[PDB]
Structure 1
């Protein structure tokens, strides 16, 4: 028994974390093979931050203007290029601790482990989800840019995030490993605001399945509901609509418990309209939507 917020063992990613210093700006870099990726605002000064042109700022910097340091080793940069919001620094030494990796772009509702680093040294790991408004709710301080989000299939690390900045509301925005931001955001300290956030419906349902596997069952009910009638009232409580694919991936969670997907959707309908009435599910007084159906099989089944 037991269900927890649980990140992948970060060792394979820690062996790729380096420090990158250009001028006076310092962030983190991801060292895979003989290429180093890092957010492009390492070439920004404390002044040119409001409205900078990175292509202008880039031509002004050459190879020896980037200082990469991997532990007690300093990597001589041989080349530089820019892909969207990341800089690709070629180095004279391929990382010997390089895992097998894929660059993937996750979609809203999926999760990943975050390895927060400072000065290229990792500091802590935790689990985040790409919220519908295309932000994550992480814990990032100054100099935490360049930290990466990832998932490990088994021996393969799927890098899917790279930290860049924090919005006024206190949440965080970043890019995939091809420099493509998550959301309508740009890397400029300006008046940017994230869209209104919604609740990841399928992740609450999957998390209610994780409770059933642990013996918790009180929230359940005898009622039935349709997909269209559920998503209607899901919309009523600022809940995302449940598509057919989401119901499909909830299958193995339905099979082991026998509780059908639409029937647990009826359990959610009752909790939305009434509340929890002072009780706690898995030790929580509000519904949690950051645990995918995958994250539950990874921990409860088997």
Structure 2
């Protein structure tokens, strides 16, 4: 019993983190086989960031302009290329600790573990969700660029996020490992800002199921709702509409507790319209939306990883 924000074990990713230096800039890179992936803005000076011509800036660079350090060992760069917003540095050594991996672009609402790194050295791990507005509410200090987010699937480590920048409100923007930003953000100094956000309804329901699994039941009722009527209430409270796909993904938690998804929706409708009346759920006085259905399953069933 118990329910905590729980990250995936980070060891397989820790063994892939390196330090990348170009000119006066140092950040983090991801070393998989004989390639190091990092944000392409490592090649930019402060002046360059105003309107960087990345193709021109990269043409002027050579392999020796890039320093890669894995622990206390220098890896010599023997090639460089650019894929969207990610720099790929071919190095003289394949990472002997490379896990089975894939690059996956996640959807808004889905969570991942972030391994916050500085100077190529992992410093902490925590859970984040990709918000509907395509930002993450991370915790990152100077030097954190290139830190990565990941999940572990049944097959392998699934890298989904590379950290690029902090937005004015203190939330964070980055790319997948193919270098495509989540959301409309760009790796230039512009006026860009996060748009309005929305609460991830399927995750709130998953967390209510986690609460029932853990013995918190006061919010269950005998009321019913249709999916349409629930979604109208959800929209009033700036929750995302719940799709039938989301209902289907909640199936395993519905089965584990014996509470049909639409009955949990009737509970959530009352919570949105009436609040908690001084009660708590899993120790919280607010509804939590950064656990996915699978996050609840992996924690409440004790799934383990390679």
**TM-score when scaled to structure 2?**
0.97
Partner Cα distance (1:210, 1:51) in 2: 47
Cα distance, 1:52 vs structure 2:
1.3
Partner Cα distance (1:10, 1:151) in 2: 10
Alignment RMSD, CA only? 0.9
Cα pair 1:29 1:120 within 8 Å, conserved? yes
Cα distance, 1:221 vs structure 2:
1.5
Residue deviations 1:166-197 (CA, integer Å, cap 9, x gap): 10011000000000100010011221011100
Residue deviations 1:243-299 (CA, integer Å, cap 9, x gap): 011000100100111111001000000000111112111011100000000010111
Partner Cα distance (1:256, 1:101) in 2: 31
Question: Secondary structure at the residue paired with 1:160?
Answer: strand
Partner Cα distance (1:155, 1:7) in 2: 17
Partner Cα distance (1:64, 1:210) in 2: 52
Residue deviations 1:231-250 (CA, integer Å, cap 9, x gap): 11111110000001100010
Partner Cα distance (1:164, 1:231) in 2: 35
Partner Cα distance (1:4, 1:188) in 2: 37
Partner Cα distance (1:109, 1:19) in 2: 30
**Range 106-115 or range 153-162, more displaced:** 153-162
**Range 201-210 or range 276-285, more displaced:** 276-285
Cα pair 1:99 1:155 within 8 Å, conserved? no
4+ aligned runs moved over 3 Å, structure 1: none
Partner Cα distance (2:219, 2:165) in 1: 39
Question: Secondary structure at the residue paired with 2:3?
Answer: coil
Question: Secondary structure at the residue paired with 1:87?
Answer: strand
Q: How does 1:252-267 map to 2 (within 5 A)?
A: 252-267=252-267
Partner Cα distance (2:58, 2:125) in 1: 32
Partner Cα distance (1:133, 1:196) in 2: 6
Cα distance, 1:46 vs structure 2:
2.1
Residue deviations 1:106-138 (CA, integer Å, cap 9, x gap): 101111100000000010000000000011000
